[PDB]
């Protein structure tokens, strides 16, 4: 589902994210918390901004996972299996939240990347879409 050209772009974005997972992830979550206040209900934090320590720790786990998924595109179903069960069977996070964070990750990259063409935007969106698909596959 990923042309050879999309994997190259995905491969470029993953290296930018891997440099500062806490900072990037924290910004992604802060945007999600502002635009969709309902998603805050899963976290018991005192600070919901990107400056929060808890937000940065969680944001770090989230972004590193994306980086790894970008590494395992040829088999996202098998690579993401464990995280899906954790979300679907243990955390029980409403899957409707996944696509909302995807859009916030996209806005975050747009404010940081030097080049974020519609072509690059499309490849990233397709990767985030596939990850959201896998993360909601083991709820029922």
């Amino acid at each position: 589902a990923f042309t050879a050209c999309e994997k190259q772009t995905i491969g470029k974005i993953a290296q930018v994210l891997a440099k500062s997972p806490e900072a990037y992830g924290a910004e992604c979550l802060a945007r999600l918390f502002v635009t969709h206040p309902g998603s805050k209900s899963y976290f018991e934090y005192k600070d919901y901004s990107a400056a929060g320590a808890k937000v940065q720790v969680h944001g770090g786990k989230v972004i590193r996972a994306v980086v790894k998924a970008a590494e395992h595109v040829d088999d996202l179903h098998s690579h993401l299996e464990t995280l899906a069960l954790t979300h679907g069977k243990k955390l029980l996070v409403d899957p409707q939240n996944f696509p909302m964070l995807s859009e916030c990750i996209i806005v975050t990259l747009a404010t940081h990347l030097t080049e974020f063409s519609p072509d690059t935007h499309c490849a990233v969106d397709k990767l985030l879409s596939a990850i959201c698909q896998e993360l909601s596959s083991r709820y029922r």
Binding site: P37, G38, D94, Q96
Partner: protein, 136 residues
């Protein structure tokens, strides 16, 4: 939102002539099975009962039906209670109301026409909005 007399009547009449407590009880159970993640909030309350909860939910809806033009003001506290106290993901609100529509459909059968479904959809949309308002 503006209500026509027909919509007011459909909603008010159903609440006075249908056993909404049973309908909501079955809607909750349906919800826990089709959308398992919603169990999150109750697996912790050891003595939780669908029957009792439904009664508490229908008591609020019954109230919304009486002040249909000011559901936002009426549910202000209920909304704050769900956001700050219970920490219920507002995205889950429609999962319950959607299940109530399925139970109403199952109960009224061919009498639950697309037009009638539209009235209930509209009503639940107003209720979801009122109860999701105080989420900051």
């Amino acid at each position: 939102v503006h209500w026509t007399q027909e919509e007011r009547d459909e909603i008010s009449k159903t609440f006075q002539g249908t056993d909404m407590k049973t309908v909501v009880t079955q809607a909750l159970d349906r919800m826990f099975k089709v959308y398992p993640w919603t169990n999150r909030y109750f697996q912790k309350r050891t003595d939780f009962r669908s029957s009792i909860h439904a009664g508490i939910v229908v008591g609020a809806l019954q109230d919304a039906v009486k002040h249909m033009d000011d559901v936002k003001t009426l549910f202000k506290d209920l909304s704050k209670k769900h956001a700050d106290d219970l920490h219920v993901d507002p995205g889950s609100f429609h999962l319950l109301t959607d299940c109530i529509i399925v139970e109403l459909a199952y109960l009224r059968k061919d009498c639950f026409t697309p037009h009638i479904q539209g009235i209930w959809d509209k009503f639940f949309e107003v209720v979801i909005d009122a109860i999701s308002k105080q989420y900051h």
